[model samples]
Target: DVQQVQKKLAALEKQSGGRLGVALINTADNSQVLYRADERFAMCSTSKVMTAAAVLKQSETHDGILQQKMTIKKADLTNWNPVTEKYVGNTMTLAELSAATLQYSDNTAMNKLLAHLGGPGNVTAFARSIGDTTFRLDRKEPELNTAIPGDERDTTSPLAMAKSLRKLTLGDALAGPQRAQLVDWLKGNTTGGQSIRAGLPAHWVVGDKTGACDYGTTNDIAVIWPEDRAPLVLVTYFTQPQQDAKWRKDVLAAAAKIVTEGK
Candidate 1:
């Protein structure tokens, strides 16, 4: 039944409008739902999850990158979100930068963390090692975004992101204090109560990150921990440039019903 829903949602790519990708995974036992999962879709700020994962790996395998410190000079800034703008010309540890990147999807801090990891390729390499074949990690946030073509945007398949999110949710990807730290940051996310986070069972705790660009792409990746059941990770990527954020929320509300309430 869920897979049939995937088929219909996939057809919406042409029927209702532009591109969109949807992916879901169950953590208790690995079951999945995927729509338009074949190739690249602009992952937007969802890349930050992968970016933060790479950082934690470095902290685990090499140096204590998390404990390292860096300050935001006026020149190091790129784009601003609520938190990043407030911290301009201030100092932060790499851990705090990771928090800003994931918490509110802060762009300036994301770019800074990317630089700290040595560049885009490093992030991509680590992701590939961990079973994500569809993400093309190429650019920083809010900079080359809509100015570039859709195909060239930092992109990933819905399934690729789902798998990554699932791995992290199971603690197969990170462990110990690093895992605790990342989970803490995710719970701190002050972003969307809409999108895939909307319409869930009231008791479900969703750890999520939301991404959007002026070019009409909107994406969200989340891990849902239910008190009564297993964890579910849902990723919805939409390139419906003419539609607004509310449209994505409405669509996700319906999709969430099909998912959480369906047999």
Candidate 2:
């Protein structure tokens, strides 16, 4: 059985230049494999997924609507800058902030949401309450905007991220209404490019988040085929020698294909 799995993993490593780390879990059978998966790596924007979850969970506890509007002050606008520079000074509801955070990986919206959710301490506290410790939020003043020179904006391990994604997908972390809101926001995620999306059949639904920084660090965590066989939790990270977005995308695509097609 190990050999069979190894054969598939070897092929994936070859295709990905041995810079790949992956984990695939079948929620139905509770099976998984980890190849260099324990190593801590830059989480990049993938942390937004947790940030989104934490925000929703807190809102639900307070009996607040996910779509509740929060006025955007000029200060909030200063940190709402995305790499694309869209959505600056935009008055976004909690739901809109969560959606934009995932769909566009909007840094500004992320910081705004984090603040509205009570900052990194709240995010970490929520994760701890859920028994998720492998993930950590950054602590810089502009929590979401503190980017180090030549370093990742956020950091996390694939194993932890996959676990979190699966929890959100199953609606196990938050109550019914909150979970529904979280999943709805996830369905709108549009930031990972064609990498993770390339694996699914045309009709299969996927909710995923991806992160990238200079020096070839790329990360993706996704829940796929949620309605069919046991949902698959696929987490992959890469640190290629060459910084190439295409290569990162290809590596992700290749990893997804391997798991989707194997066993």
Candidate 3:
């Protein structure tokens, strides 16, 4: 039963020497395996995906929003710009901004897009509207990554995130085009190679996002499409109290493998 799965996850957490929160839901049957799925963990850059979804939600009402372009400023630059760093002082379409933020976890790109949505609170509001009551985004980037132990700011439970990911990508939360567009952005994500994506069998397709922050927090949320069955939505959040603790991709990979096989 699911209790066996929970015991296995506990072993993995002990072996990895960290706290691991996991939630795996089979969209086909609505079956779930959950361990500490209600506990708080850093949201880190994963909030970018929600921001991207919120942007797409706005696209429905705001004509030409995705095609609109805005110039980047040096002042807008923040830590871990990645793609956004190279585009400072140049204009990029909102679609490109969402791509940079979602695909590469670009901090500057996230800030600009978040600003466009009015603030972090708006993103949280959108999550609530979609029936995800446990997700919270209280700060912008850099600050969002300040994951102090036991802090609730900018954090989400694994179950909450997986549910939101499913609703945004698979359900009727967004229009047809926007839903497909959101899935495309996450599918093209360049940052999740070492986490959930690494754990699945080669033939399975995945759309995922990765996040890392202080206090040894690392996370991956994904929708995995299997060849023979419906997609599975999963999220794993790993963290340790020590600031210098190392984040392990193998731990995430192993957790994903267990849940995928356990089910």
Candidate 4:
């Protein structure tokens, strides 16, 4: 199966023209690889995983943090993302904002959470607990314009992202019903469904977050549930590779095909 996955990787290299990093972790056997994953890449909105985790960590004691309703102000309508804007002046639960953050890659929702969680430092501090040291989440989504090039925006390597996803999905950070609740939120994620989800066979499930910044970085990190087998964490990150704009997403499906075809 390793060889099969490797062969698939080789094909993926051809498909992606080596402009991306891909990592796969078989949670069942500790089977895994970096696959050019050492190169740290911009996580873009995928950094929400950390942001959400930090909130989840606090939710343990904050009580109803998710159910707490926050009214969207006119100032909250930063057009960096459109999905969360329509709810302007309307109130949505913290949990709903979290869902919109991941499902629609909503910039406003992320910033709201960032502000509520005591800014990016709260999220960054918790990220260290999970081994994602290089993560550079230094600014709010609104402050992203003030970010330093190449390092200002949030960043994380493929392996870090994969391991992070595994940790959350495999019950390292969250436990019991809360873990299931978070998983359900990610499962309901409707954003990257067309990527890894499209590439997977029927009946298998992929709970993932997708991030795209500018026209240059395209990424998807996922916890895949295969029927009759342990779940696998598959992560793909792409830099500008002179490919179709759609490759930012389609390539995920392509790599996923190889991953799910045999095992």
Candidate 5:
């Protein structure tokens, strides 16, 4: 079954001008296949997923109130000015910041949240706590991965990401409340327009995160059909393409359709 899927995906990648990579796992039984799933690529804003998850994990460990208010300072405002502008200078609760980070992929909110939670190293600790060894969360200060240099960053493989999402959906990595919170936040993420979202029925709920950069890499990871059928973890990445945007969207859409329809 996995090999058959890979064959289809190879054809899709070719059709898309070789701009795509993908991994799909049926969470119900742990079935999967991938094209370039192990290749490292720019994680883009999808790194926010780890940042958000780290925040929730810390809150749970500290018994911190999710609704606790945190004042945003100029430092916190440095990266996420647009988010601050969007919220119109209102004090954001931990809940609100997490929502902003995931839903809008708010870079400023994410940096602030990471700082408030104890910087990017803390976030890395959280991911490690959850058994995500391959994933790295890059921070603006005291850069972690020197190969890339500075805060500009990258992240885990598509297969690894699918595993992470599966862990979340299965309630293995986070507490129940935290898991629910992450799922809710991802459902509202503003970036899920095409790709996984495009492949599903209008009424079927799909919660996902997307990442992209100017160099022509686009990626997505998600838990699909959470309510009705057995949930599946799907991930796709595209890079160095003949046609980047259109092919990324098209291949992902097709992947989603295949997974959802069980074709």
Candidate 6:
């Protein structure tokens, strides 16, 4: 039962010395398991998923937008960027930018996509359009990564994030092709191995995005496909008190374990 899962989650949170926000939705039955779901947590690099959604939404209105090319300069590097640094000062398609940001959490590419959408506000607007009013993005990388305690900027609730991800990936928020494209990007993500992905049955397929920053934030959001069943949306966000506190991704994996297989 979810109650059993929730109780285990509480113990985990106590051991973590931090707050944990999780949202688990089984699309087949709409069953959910949530813990501290309404509490806010920093978006960090995970915002790339929403940013990519906004870019995809723009593509729906502006034909050929994804094909548009843009170049980034060495001066534009966000330092945290791993995939985009090599291409600095070179042209890449908006589609390539989306893949970089979503699949690799490329900070520079995320900034470029945010700029292409007019700013972080537009990404917030897109989330609103999809009926998730709780998601907010107010700054660029490094700054948005501040994640100061009690700060609401660039943050979202786990419930809101999971709901929005459902709409974008499995609902009708975008046309079928664009939705598939977003799903593909998330499936290609290389960052979630130690978190949500670690708790699932090996044969299940999954698409996910991850984020981290100071204050011990470590997060993962995913769409998982269970054999012979409809897909599931799972989100986990973790944050501790100390700015330099050790981030425990294994905590997330155990939380995932509790939700998926706990007694």
lDDT of 1 by residue, 1-263 (tens): 76667666755555646666677787677877766666567777878988988888778876776778887877776766656667767777788888988998888888888889888888888788788767777877675355234465478788888888777656578767677777777767877677776767766787888877745776777888877687788888777655342335555545555565542
Model 3: CA > 4 A from native:
none
Residues 88-136 of candidate 6 have per-residue lDDT tens digits of: 7788889999998888888889888988889999999999999988999
Better of 1 and 4 by lDDT: 4
Estimate the TM-score for candidate 5: 0.84
Name the weakest run of 10 consecutive residues (lDDT summed) in model 3.
254-263
Off by over 4 Å in 1: 3-16, 62-64, 147-150, 241-247
lDDT of each: 0.73, 0.69, 0.90, 0.75, 0.70, 0.89
Worst 10 residues of 4 by lDDT: 143-152
User: Sorted by lDDT, highest first, which candidate order results?
Assistant: 3, 6, 4, 1, 5, 2
Candidate 2: the clashing residue pairs are: 43-155, 80-108
lDDT (Cα, tens digit) per residue for candidate 4, span 1-263 = 66877777777777665466788888888877556777767677788877887777778788878898888888787765566677776887878788888877788889888888888887888888767676768777745422123554666778877887788778577766567767887887878866778888868877889877643567888888888799989888876643234436877777777766666
Pick the winner on lDDT between candidates 1 and 2. Answer: 1
Error of 6 at 58 (Å): 1.2
Ten contiguous residues minimizing lDDT sum, candidate 5: 141-150
RMSD to true structure for each model, in Å: 2.8, 3.6, 1.2, 2.8, 3.7, 1.3
How far in Å is the alpha carbon of 43 misplaced in model 2? 0.8
Q: Model 6, clash count?
A: 0
What is candidate 5's lDDT per residue for 178-202, written digit by digit as tens? Answer: 8898998888878789877887777
Candidate 1 at 90: error in angstroms? 2.6
Q: What is the lDDT of residue 192 in candidate 3?
A: 91
The regions of model 4 sitting more than 4 angstroms off are 1-4, 7-11, 14-18, 80-83, 142-152, 241-247
Estimated TM-score per prediction? 0.88, 0.83, 0.97, 0.88, 0.84, 0.97
| Error of model 6, residue 156, in angstroms | 0.5
> Residue 81: error of model 3 in Å?
1.7
User: Lowest summed-lDDT stretch of 10 residues in model 2?
Assistant: 140-149
RMSD of 1: 2.8
Which pairs clash in model 5? 79-108, 80-108
